[PDB]
Design an enzyme around this catalytic site. Structure first.
Site, PDB file in Angstrom:
ATOM      1  N   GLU A   1      -0.958   0.179  -7.527  1.00 44.68           N
ATOM      2  CA  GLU A   1      -0.723   1.377  -8.309  1.00 44.68           C
ATOM      3  C   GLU A   1       0.730   1.428  -8.773  1.00 44.68           C
ATOM      4  O   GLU A   1       1.639   1.027  -8.041  1.00 44.68           O
ATOM      5  CB  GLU A   1      -1.033   2.625  -7.491  1.00 44.68           C
ATOM      6  CG  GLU A   1      -2.434   3.168  -7.669  1.00 44.68           C
ATOM      7  CD  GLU A   1      -2.491   4.670  -7.478  1.00 44.68           C
ATOM      8  OE1 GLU A   1      -2.228   5.137  -6.350  1.00 44.68           O
ATOM      9  OE2 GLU A   1      -2.791   5.383  -8.457  1.00 44.68           O
TER      10      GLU A   1
ATOM     11  N   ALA B   1      -6.963  -1.066  -6.226  1.00 43.72           N
ATOM     12  CA  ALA B   1      -8.153  -1.729  -5.715  1.00 43.72           C
ATOM     13  C   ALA B   1      -9.286  -0.762  -5.398  1.00 43.72           C
ATOM     14  O   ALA B   1     -10.408  -1.216  -5.146  1.00 43.72           O
ATOM     15  CB  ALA B   1      -7.811  -2.540  -4.461  1.00 43.72           C
TER      16      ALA B   1
ATOM     17  N   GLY C   1       0.794  -1.213   0.000  1.00 40.94           N
ATOM     18  CA  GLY C   1       0.000   0.000   0.000  1.00 40.94           C
ATOM     19  C   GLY C   1       0.829   1.266   0.000  1.00 40.94           C
ATOM     20  O   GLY C   1       2.049   1.217   0.177  1.00 40.94           O
TER      21      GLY C   1
ATOM     22  N   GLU D   1      12.261 -13.791  21.796  1.00 44.86           N
ATOM     23  CA  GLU D   1      12.040 -13.353  23.171  1.00 44.86           C
ATOM     24  C   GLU D   1      10.779 -12.506  23.288  1.00 44.86           C
ATOM     25  O   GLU D   1      10.014 -12.654  24.248  1.00 44.86           O
ATOM     26  CB  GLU D   1      13.260 -12.585  23.680  1.00 44.86           C
ATOM     27  CG  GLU D   1      14.529 -13.418  23.726  1.00 44.86           C
ATOM     28  CD  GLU D   1      15.653 -12.726  24.471  1.00 44.86           C
ATOM     29  OE1 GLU D   1      15.568 -12.623  25.714  1.00 44.86           O
ATOM     30  OE2 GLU D   1      16.622 -12.291  23.818  1.00 44.86           O
TER      31      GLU D   1
ATOM     32  N   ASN E   1      -3.417   7.237  13.214  1.00 43.14           N
ATOM     33  CA  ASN E   1      -2.892   8.542  12.831  1.00 43.14           C
ATOM     34  C   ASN E   1      -3.355   9.645  13.774  1.00 43.14           C
ATOM     35  O   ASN E   1      -2.622  10.616  13.993  1.00 43.14           O
ATOM     36  CB  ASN E   1      -3.299   8.867  11.396  1.00 43.14           C
ATOM     37  CG  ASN E   1      -2.417   8.183  10.376  1.00 43.14           C
ATOM     38  OD1 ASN E   1      -1.349   7.671  10.708  1.00 43.14           O
ATOM     39  ND2 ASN E   1      -2.860   8.168   9.124  1.00 43.14           N
TER      40      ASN E   1
ATOM     41  N   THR F   1     -10.867   8.707   6.509  1.00 41.79           N
ATOM     42  CA  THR F   1     -10.706   9.176   5.141  1.00 41.79           C
ATOM     43  C   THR F   1     -11.400   8.294   4.114  1.00 41.79           C
ATOM     44  O   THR F   1     -11.425   8.653   2.932  1.00 41.79           O
ATOM     45  CB  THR F   1      -9.216   9.284   4.785  1.00 41.79           C
ATOM     46  OG1 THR F   1      -8.597   7.997   4.905  1.00 41.79           O
ATOM     47  CG2 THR F   1      -8.517  10.267   5.711  1.00 41.79           C
TER      48      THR F   1
HETATM   49  N1  LIG Z   1       0.622   7.960   8.791  1.00 41.21           N
HETATM   50  C1  LIG Z   1       0.582   7.787   7.473  1.00 41.21           C
HETATM   51  N2  LIG Z   1      -0.469   7.099   6.901  1.00 41.21           N
HETATM   52  C2  LIG Z   1      -0.516   6.919   5.560  1.00 41.21           C
HETATM   53  C3  LIG Z   1       0.494   7.425   4.754  1.00 41.21           C
HETATM   54  N3  LIG Z   1       0.203   7.108   3.475  1.00 41.21           N
HETATM   55  C4  LIG Z   1      -0.958   6.416   3.454  1.00 41.21           C
HETATM   56  N4  LIG Z   1      -1.423   6.296   4.737  1.00 41.21           N
HETATM   57  C5  LIG Z   1      -2.655   5.599   5.148  1.00 41.21           C
HETATM   58  O1  LIG Z   1      -3.209   4.919   4.036  1.00 41.21           O
HETATM   59  C6  LIG Z   1      -4.600   5.145   3.938  1.00 41.21           C
HETATM   60  C7  LIG Z   1      -5.048   5.159   2.478  1.00 41.21           C
HETATM   61  O2  LIG Z   1      -4.798   3.931   1.819  1.00 41.21           O
HETATM   62  P1  LIG Z   1      -3.526   3.784   0.843  1.00 41.21           P
HETATM   63  O3  LIG Z   1      -2.357   4.529   1.437  1.00 41.21           O
HETATM   64  O4  LIG Z   1      -3.855   4.326  -0.527  1.00 41.21           O
HETATM   65  O5  LIG Z   1      -3.176   2.212   0.749  1.00 41.21           O
HETATM   66  P2  LIG Z   1      -3.886   1.210  -0.298  1.00 41.21           P
HETATM   67  O6  LIG Z   1      -4.150  -0.139   0.325  1.00 41.21           O
HETATM   68  O7  LIG Z   1      -2.997   1.054  -1.508  1.00 41.21           O
HETATM   69  O8  LIG Z   1      -5.257   1.922  -0.752  1.00 41.21           O
HETATM   70  P3  LIG Z   1      -5.807   1.813  -2.263  1.00 41.21           P
HETATM   71  O9  LIG Z   1      -5.118   2.843  -3.125  1.00 41.21           O
HETATM   72  O10 LIG Z   1      -7.296   2.067  -2.275  1.00 41.21           O
HETATM   73  O11 LIG Z   1      -5.540   0.429  -2.803  1.00 41.21           O
HETATM   74  C8  LIG Z   1      -4.842   6.474   4.636  1.00 41.21           C
HETATM   75  O12 LIG Z   1      -6.062   6.461   5.338  1.00 41.21           O
HETATM   76  C9  LIG Z   1      -3.691   6.611   5.609  1.00 41.21           C
HETATM   77  O13 LIG Z   1      -4.126   6.298   6.910  1.00 41.21           O
HETATM   78  C10 LIG Z   1       1.554   8.118   5.322  1.00 41.21           C
HETATM   79  O14 LIG Z   1       2.454   8.573   4.616  1.00 41.21           O
HETATM   80  N5  LIG Z   1       1.593   8.296   6.687  1.00 41.21           N
END
Ligand SMILES: Nc1nc2c(ncn2[C@@H]2O[C@H](COP(=O)(O)OP(=O)(O)OP(=O)(O)O)[C@@H](O)[C@H]2O)c(=O)[nH]1
Ligand SMILES: Nc1nc2c(ncn2[C@@H]2O[C@H](COP(=O)(O)OP(=O)(O)O)[C@@H](O)[C@H]2O)c(=O)[nH]1
Ligand SMILES: Nc1nc2c(ncn2[C@@H]2O[C@H](COP(=O)(O)OP(=O)(O)O)[C@@H](O)[C@H]2O)c(=O)[nH]1
Ligand SMILES: [Mg+2]
Lengths: 430, 48, 48, 427, 427
Positions: free
Chosen positions: A62, A90, A10, A245, A197, A170
């Site tokens: 992606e 997805a 992701g 451990e 977050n 989000t």
């Molecule tokens: N803390 C933090 N969270 C992130 C960051 N990047 C993505 N996220 C988390 O990722 C979520 C969104 O999903 P994606 O990052 O796109 O991951 P994914 O499974 O590929 O989602 P899809 O594109 O729909 O397939 C957000 O709600 C964030 O909580 C980051 O740089 N820092």
């Protein structure tokens, strides 16, 4: 001699991975071009001629963000084989990333990790990162962990995932992906930590002095915890801590593995110059609910597991005194059937900071990983949010058409209910 | 030559336009053939 | 002599972090300032 | 990275698309002759999404333009960026629109569709990483209302997987220009409901209203109106073309904002908008953008959301900005006006961030939302369509082309069922 | 942090408000183009109280301007500091003032109030800790008198917690300039009593007396007349904006000065004042300021406090001076003239000191008092209104706008009750 393999899925995983491997290169002293101006074997591989390569695998559906890494400064360090990208995402759908799309790229990634696993003679486990709210993070992650369970058997599959925040969300389909993934890794994951977050947003503001935070700051704080967790096996210390451990102590049962984490001291670059930062101060700061990166109050629940990790100018006498002082705190409750509940490790290497960073250098630091019944607060919240959706079938049609059988929805609901009941039963006293 | 030919319209038919487009095409063919004839690096001619 | 770790730690990067952050501010406030100037240019053109 | 084919139908569609391509060419920095002359390397990272490449260092958009009369096509080519379009892409007949939906659908539609299908298939198979097609058309006249639906049916038949995102010019219920317009909108809606995945409605009344409320333009024309529409055009696909902190394609929007298959009609809004005088006074912050986006005046749809309720919402923000600031604003705006969101959907809002902002603006954002206020827009035409259908005056112009009376009956029954379905989800 | 929103209504309100903004702009050091060019860093400590930030180092006041006629908006735009105010905040109608309370309240008030509320709501969200709203209006004609009450009621409905304070000008007993002022004032009193927490009354005749007595103005004008009122408004808010030995905000003042909810009408005064040729002789000291403040000639309300009894009062001082000297002066004046004050409220006079004095003056002070001398002003309007309403047919002008004659009797009954309450608390 001993090795750990890293897997990132992701968008969340890759930017966290970018934040991590940035620290390790500075911490081990590896230039961005792969050469030097030790602990390298654990995390890097030598190909002769003085060139190093990370033992990391980045996978995404992606092609966008992975290409940005391919165009970044650290492009020459990473092998093109390691960085794998897909064709279409997805779209926050767990159904799409599990059956329809994820099943295409699953075999290629499995081939790569096995190829990289051959070079690791002393491989002891894997580190996996997830985006629970994302379709790729959950949809592909569940398939990957299911395959990994049978591919290697008794191998430590350690996870560090981003749980949905209690209030900030989000994705409108966030509850569905979270519970279905929850049903998935509860059987396969050896030990998975939770962070949200929203708690990191508050901590980086109340404690650290960054008025206007971004995702980049959150990733760096996450990387510090990961570095301290694995720093015991990279350097000498009076009490080394191995992954086995943690697995033996932090869990009292198979299904109660979920820990919460803490880190201290987090402090601005100038606030540290005007404080003492003794062993007691950093130890007492950990137990405050404000430092938990999971938005649940520990006072609601009880503790039945803890593990201290020290990276600093630390003498074991002070650690015993600090633990004894904490034991006398009546604001902290311990279950009757866990009288000690502590293991502490000492490592001499101080944490490494980043130029242009936010964390002040801290000459001695301590890490916390604890298991508590207070995690049941987060499980209940996601349950009512799911029931608000599923009672009127808010978004079911997307999942069914993408391969999901509707019978899976009550199965994940019932599995979560059993886990909540199991947590309550263990919390009870006899 | 080609730029003016780009400045033409669709569906239109008039002997004035049709002559212009027809002469436009024929002039383009002549100039291209002249260019191809002169494209050679060695040219032996007897000037008048 | 743990204080050796104390002093060799404190001095280098934290003080440098101050100057780096102090330099970061000096970049940023005129960075926005030139962003403002190009926006003002975009007013005068779009006004015309 | 992911390529999209752009389709334009009707007199309204061609002119809007002409302004749309000007905006896209400007942002990528493409010279009118077709040569890239920009200033940043980010522009060429993913320019293959909307443009093709020729063996002369030139770029050609994947644009297909359709009309029944050649007058509009010559006007489009005469434009400043007319040369940028491929000469063969201009598909057109030699018959007038007739302003009749039935005449365009049956007589001219069956004639043109065969040739357009081959042209589209040429562009469709010219690239492999294919996303869905994009359509722009009007529902008032004959060419847009009829041919656009006929092509949409063919597009759905050939490529079920791809997303058929359409933008529609809803007949202005108080300002429109066609006498037989309620018939055209009534008939076209039935085809659009079952085929199009995404439908966005734009009303000329709103465009004039927003222009005079906010921009304070002295002499508005369609050129300014097309520019405002083009801003939403570019903001929708922004995550595809450029990096961001949280990517979101069209499929992400479709999954999140559609609770049930027949509920996909959406309203769109853009920010920031300022009169050419007042921008010395604004602060350009996320709260500033949030105030403009959620305001009902900026909505380019002739419906007041306060009369209805929301059940899905989303917003895309362009620029280097905080994730936390967007999170706070959406959480506060959701908690402050809780009466307008249904209980059984927690977190009715969606967020996404793209790193690269548009030209001239440090901060920009686009809002796409759904509400039950759509019941007003279709009620207006339904009540009027009933007035025509009671006396059956103008039906004779549609019968003469072979159209049966059952087409009117089925169409209005479809709209009535759609309105009832939106009524139930009020509770 | 303790921001303040300013509202100006009608002809008198806009002209006073423009002078009000002019003085404060000079005090903080804001150049007429809107860019800071001051000399002291203390000026930017708390500029957020009255000023908003626009990108480019330009500051814009939180000013809302309302009038029914555009001619007043022509004057403020043409003024020296007209460019400073936000152009969008200029909300105005397109009809005459009407010189009627009912016409403003019912006919044009309903049309304008919605737009005014939205514009005010914009500035209401641009402040973290908005302490309260500030209104400047007149009770004479009906534009400010009529619409101001409607706006003040709506603001109280929206923001019950915030402290609503108004600066009102009453019809003069001898220099009244409208045949029908008593009707307008009587109706407005009913809303003023129940809505506003703090009310300050200023009469034009007392202002003419002050200027001709002390300032020795041969040809005084409204600009000279409004300068004193601008100073009074500036002095009241000085605690919020600058440091002091004893900070005292409005909510401190309301608690001290108001013994009972309805007794909140106050009288204000300013010191020092000196003729332009007499400043050489004056050795200005703290006792000299105290002598000016409590002198009856310096009071801007045409009601002698000596005839009545004093309730709680407060004085705010600006500049550097001994706390002991200030404390001793109030104890002396409180004990010397005990006949003026009510016996059952010791410590009648409250103190407050701010460090930073205004321009040109080494120190200055402001006086605010509550007393039963207001009954004379209400007696004057009551006697005139009684002789007005005896000819009951003159009400027909207000009847045309929907005002029933029973409203006049109810308003006078409430106003008489306020007089009676002031009578009982005398002893
Ligand atoms: N803390 C933090 N969270 C992130 C960051 N990047 C993505 N996220 C988390 O990722 C979520 C969104 O999903 P994606 O990052 O796109 O991951 P994914 O499974 O590929 O989602 P899809 O594109 O729909 O397939 C957000 O709600 C964030 O909580 C980051 O740089 N820092
Ligand atoms: N905003 C905008 N609207 C337009 C433009 N051109 C035409 N329109 C409107 O859109 C409608 C187009 O009708 P249309 O269905 O395309 O006619 P058809 O040729 O029979 O299909 C007309 O009523 C115009 O008022 C334009 O450039 N911009
Ligand atoms: N002190 C002062 N009084 C003013 C000024 N302008 C108007 N007035 C007075 O305000 C009174 C009524 O004004 P009007 O236009 O009826 O205000 P309205 O009640 O809002 O309609 C008149 O008697 C004027 O003398 C000014 O600039 N200063
Ligand atoms: Mg993702």
């Amino acid at each position: 001699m001993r090795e750990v393999i890293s897997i990132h899925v992701g968008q969340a995983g890759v930017q966290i991975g970018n934040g991590c491997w940035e620290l390790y290169c500075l911490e081990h002293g590896i230039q961005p071009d792969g050469q030097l101006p030790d602990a390298f074997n654990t995390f890097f591989s030598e190909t002769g001629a003085g060139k190093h390569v990370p033992r990391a695998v980045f996978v995404d559906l992606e092609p966008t963000v992975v290409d940005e890494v391919r165009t970044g400064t650290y492009r020459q360090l990473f092998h093109p084989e390691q960085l794998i990208s897909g064709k279409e995402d997805a779209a926050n759908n767990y159904a799409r990333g599990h059956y329809t799309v994820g099943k295409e790229i699953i075999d290629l990634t499995l081939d790569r990790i096995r190829k990289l696993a051959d070079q690791c003679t002393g491989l002891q486990g894997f580190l996996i990162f997830h985006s629970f709210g994302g379709g790729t993070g959950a949809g592909f992650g569940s398939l990957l962990l299911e395959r990994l369970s049978v591919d290697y058997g008794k191998k430590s599959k350690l996870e560090f995932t981003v749980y949905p925040s209690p209030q900030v969300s989000t994705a409108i389909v966030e509850p569905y992906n979270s519970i279905l993934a929850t049903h998935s890794m509860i059987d396969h994951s050896d030990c998975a930590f939770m962070v949200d977050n929203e708690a990191l947003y508050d901590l980086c503001r109340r404690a650290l002095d960054i008025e206007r935070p971004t995702y980049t700051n959150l990733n760096r704080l996450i990387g510090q915890v990961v570095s301290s967790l694995t720093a015991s096996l990279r350097f000498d210390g009076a009490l080394n801590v191995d992954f086995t451990e943690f697995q033996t102590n932090l869990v009292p049962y198979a299904r109660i593995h979920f820990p919460i984490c803490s880190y201290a001291p987090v402090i601005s670059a100038e606030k540290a110059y005007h404080e003492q930062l003794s062993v007691a101060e950093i130890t007492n700061s950990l137990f405050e609910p404000a430092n938990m990166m999971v938005k649940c109050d520990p006072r609601h629940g009880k503790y039945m597991a803890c593990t201290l990790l020290y990276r600093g100018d630390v003498v074991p006498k002070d650690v015993s005194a600090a633990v004894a002082t904490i034991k006398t705190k009546r604001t902290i409750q311990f279950v009757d059937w866990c009288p000690t509940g502590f293991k502490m490790g000492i490592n001499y290497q101080p944490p490494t900071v980043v130029p242009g960073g936010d964390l002040a250098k801290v000459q001695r630091a301590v890490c916390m990983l604890a298991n508590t019944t207070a995690i049941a607060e987060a499980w209940s919240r996601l349950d009512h949010k799911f029931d608000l959706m599923y009672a009127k079938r808010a978004f079911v049609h997307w999942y069914v058409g993408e391969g999901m059988e509707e019978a899976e929805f009550p199965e994940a609901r019932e599995d979560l209910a059993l886990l909540e009941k199991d947590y309550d039963e263990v919390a009870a006293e006899s | 030559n080609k730029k003016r030919y780009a400045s033409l319209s669709f569906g239109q038919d008039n002997l004035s336009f049709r002559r212009k487009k027809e002469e436009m095409e024929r002039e383009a063919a002549q100039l291209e053939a002249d260019i191809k004839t002169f494209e050679r690096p060695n040219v032996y001619i007897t000037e008048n | 002599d743990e204080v050796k770790k104390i002093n060799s730690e404190m001095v280098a990067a934290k003080a440098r972090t101050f100057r780096d952050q102090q330099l970061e501010i000096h970049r940023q406030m005129k960075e926005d300032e030139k962003a403002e100037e190009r926006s003002i240019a975009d007013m005068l053109e779009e006004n015309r | 990275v992911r390529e999209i084919v752009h389709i334009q139908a009707g007199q309204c569609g061609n002119q809007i698309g002409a302004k749309f391509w000007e905006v896209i060419s400007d942002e990528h920095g493409i010279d009118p002759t077709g040569s890239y002359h920009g200033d940043s390397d980010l522009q060429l990272e993913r320019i293959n999404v909307y443009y093709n490449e020729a063996t002369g260092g030139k770029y050609v958009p994947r644009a297909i333009l359709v009309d029944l009369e050649p007058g509009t096509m010559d006007s489009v080519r005469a434009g400043q960026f007319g040369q940028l379009f491929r000469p063969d892409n201009f598909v057109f007949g030699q018959s007038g629109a007739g302003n009749n939906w039935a005449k365009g659908y049956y007589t001219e539609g069956q004639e043109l569709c065969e040739s357009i299908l081959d042209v589209i298939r040429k562009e469709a198979e010219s690239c492999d990483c294919l996303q869905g097609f994009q359509l722009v058309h009007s529902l008032g006249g004959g060419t847009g209302a009829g041919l656009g639906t006929l092509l949409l049916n063919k597009l759905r038949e050939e490529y079920p997987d791809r997303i058929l995102s359409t933008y529609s010019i809803v007949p202005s219920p108080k300002v429109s220009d066609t006498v037989v317009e309620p018939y055209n909108c009534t008939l076209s809606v039935h085809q659009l409901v079952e085929s199009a995945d995404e439908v966005f409605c734009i009303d000329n009344e709103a465009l004039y209203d927003i222009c005079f409320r906010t921009l304070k333009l002295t002499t508005p024309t369609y050129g300014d109106l097309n520019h405002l529409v083009s801003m939403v055009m570019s903001g929708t696909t922004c995550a595809l073309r450029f990096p961001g902190q949280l990517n979101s394609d069209l499929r992400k929007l479709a999954v999140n904002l559609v609770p049930f298959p027949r509920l996909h009609f959406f309203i769109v809004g853009f920010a920031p908008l300022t009169s050419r005088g007042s921008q010395q006074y604004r602060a350009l912050t996320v709260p500033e953008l949030t105030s403009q986006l959620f305001d009902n005046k900026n909505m380019m749809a002739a419906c007041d959301p306060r009369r209805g309720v929301y059940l899905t919402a989303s917003a895309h923000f362009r620029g280097r900005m905080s994730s936390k600031e967007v999170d706070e604003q959406m959480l506060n705006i959701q908690a402050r006006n809780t009466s307008y969101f249904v209980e059984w959907i927690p977190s009715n809002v969606k967020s996404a961030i793209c790193d690269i902002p548009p030209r001239g603006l440090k901060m920009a954002a686009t809002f796409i939302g759904n509400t039950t206020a759509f019941r007003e827009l279709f009620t207006r035409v339904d009540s009027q369509f009933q007035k025509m259908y009671a006396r059956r005056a103008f039906i004779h112009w549609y019968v003469n082309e072979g159209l049966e009376t059952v087409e009117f009956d089925e169409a209005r029954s479809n709209m009535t069922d759609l309105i009832q379905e939106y009524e139930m989800y009020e509770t």
